[PDB]
Design a binder for this molecule. Structure first.
Ligand SMILES: COc1cc(/C=C/C(=O)O)ccc1O
Ligand SMILES: COc1cc(/C=C/C(=O)O)ccc1O
Ligand SMILES: COc1cc(/C=C/C(=O)O)ccc1O
Ligand SMILES: COc1cc(/C=C/C(=O)O)ccc1O
Ligand SMILES: [Ca+2]
Ligand SMILES: [Ca+2]
Lengths: 263, 263
């Protein structure tokens, strides 16, 4: 037998080392577990805000579900400069992470789901649609699916102008340099036509104080044949109150218990 | 001969596993390097905000200085619940981390310094005073040395009332539960008398947009025999603009080159 354990993992994807963390439940040698792979948000790290993904990871692990979470390229401790980041690269890494994590020794590749937060939810929704037979279920927190509309139609990124990127070479995001390549890549991105290709169980959790408009979650639901939308009164983008934190952890554990442990 | 590498490290302190990252310069097998240990801020993680400690670690590593950074107990990926967190535990851990890192194969026990950000700077100042003969130098960014005054005199923590802790059972910090034990323990904490015991080279970097009052940096200077205070015009608490991020990385590399490489 073996007690539960936290271990660090790395993988190489198109020339970048991505670094991550794995929460393995207790079990016998060689035992394989239903697994959730988690995608963090824009300019975030694999911990997520204020231990959010760590708390979710340990909750899953304490219930027999392995939890795996990597820093995307150009984020956190992975290789890559933010100035070179593109959302296309994030989607390509998300696809390659499915294959890398399904190959890990403790992962039951037949019981395998994605969890996202904010922009990570967007990536997860698109990856799920392109890899529509690979995922047992999909859970999306606070999907930041307005970012194309905001940048391309309103010419702002979280409220700050993008109109100087061409002249000045980059966008200043909290001290990080976001390059022109990111912006030139937005023309290649499609959210909802990709996302609606996934027909498995989907849960979306939206908080009424999220700065993303609620309409985007209803657009997702419009395309999902097997979706569920939970609206958390007074929940915010990052689940940054003790009551909304308890709610997001509980709602997500319930979904993955249903789709990974009881199906 | 080995190229530079990033690796993950753990240690056990008072029954908690603390988890961290080490950036090791390239060199010969078994080589021992001058080393900086970094302490993150309150409710933060070892990466720090927006890759701040990651960029600093890599800058040091590319110049022949090893960089090591752990999540404190009850923070990040380390063991422990935020509700059980106390600053006394952080101080004990910061002291114990000196020996955990100096035990590592790549670390020169005689060329070892601390770097802090915000509350981590306060922790580093106190640990430095108690273990003065262990440190070649000390660098403190944005020291949050007002927290005792703010909580004990003004009954707020970063502006939010602490007067409901007994009624609520906790203090809500961005969705984490901060417990009564933290507030009960504040009476045990002494910053400035402990800090002035360190007589090695100290550098403080303060940004004019920091929400921490500037007078706390001057108070530190009053007690240091070999201190230097750099005031970064338009710098902020987390160095979250591209100009101030460049500035903080350069000012810190200059200081550790002087104190760890050229001395
Ligand atoms: C990249 O541009 C954007 C990102 C977000 C949110 C991202 C997240 O929280 O992960 C919101 C609006 C944007 O225009
Ligand atoms: C690469 O990441 C960064 C680099 C700089 C400085 C660059 C320079 O020395 O010219 C500033 C902010 C950054 O986020
Ligand atoms: C814990 O109480 C406080 C913490 C801070 C900042 C901490 C940090 O930025 O690391 C500032 C004021 C406080 O009263
Ligand atoms: C452990 O830290 C937390 C616990 C809760 C509540 C959990 C429950 O009662 O189920 C909410 C937020 C937290 O940050
Ligand atoms: Ca020990
Ligand atoms: Ca442990």
């Amino acid at each position: 037998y073996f007690q539960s354990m936290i271990k660090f993992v790395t993988t190489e994807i198109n020339g970048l080392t991505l670094r991550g963390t794995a929460h393995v439940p207790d079990g016998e040698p060689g035992q394989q577990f239903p697994t959730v792979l988690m995608f963090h948000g824009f300019g975030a790290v694999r911990d997520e805000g204020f231990r959010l993904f760590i708390q979710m990871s340990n909750r899953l692990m304490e219930n027999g579900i392995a939890a795996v979470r990597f820093d995307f390229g150009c984020h956190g401790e992975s290789d890559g400069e933010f100035e070179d980041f593109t959302f296309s690269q994030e989607l390509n890494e998300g696809s390659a992470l499915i294959d890398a994590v399904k190959s890990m020794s403790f992962v039951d590749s037949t019981k395998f789901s994605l969890l996202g937060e904010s922009l990570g939810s967007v990536a997860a929704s698109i990856v799920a649609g392109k890899r529509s037979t690979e995922l047992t279920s999909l859970c999306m927190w606070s999907p930041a699916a307005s970012f194309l509309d905001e940048i391309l139609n309103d010419h702002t990124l979280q409220g700050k102008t993008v109109d100087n990127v061409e002249k000045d070479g980059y966008f200043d995001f909290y001290g990080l340099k976001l390059g022109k390549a990111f912006f030139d890549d937005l023309k290649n991105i499609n959210i909802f036509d990709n996302a609606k290709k996934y027909q498995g169980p989907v849960k979306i959790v939206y908080g009424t104080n999220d700065f993303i408009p609620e309409k985007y979650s209803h657009k997702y639901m419009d395309g999902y044949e097997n979706g569920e939308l939970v609206i958390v009164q007074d929940g915010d983008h990052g689940w940054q109150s003790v009551p909304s934190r308890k709610r997001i952890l509980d709602e997500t554990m319930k979904f993955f218990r249903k789709t990974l442990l009881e199906a």
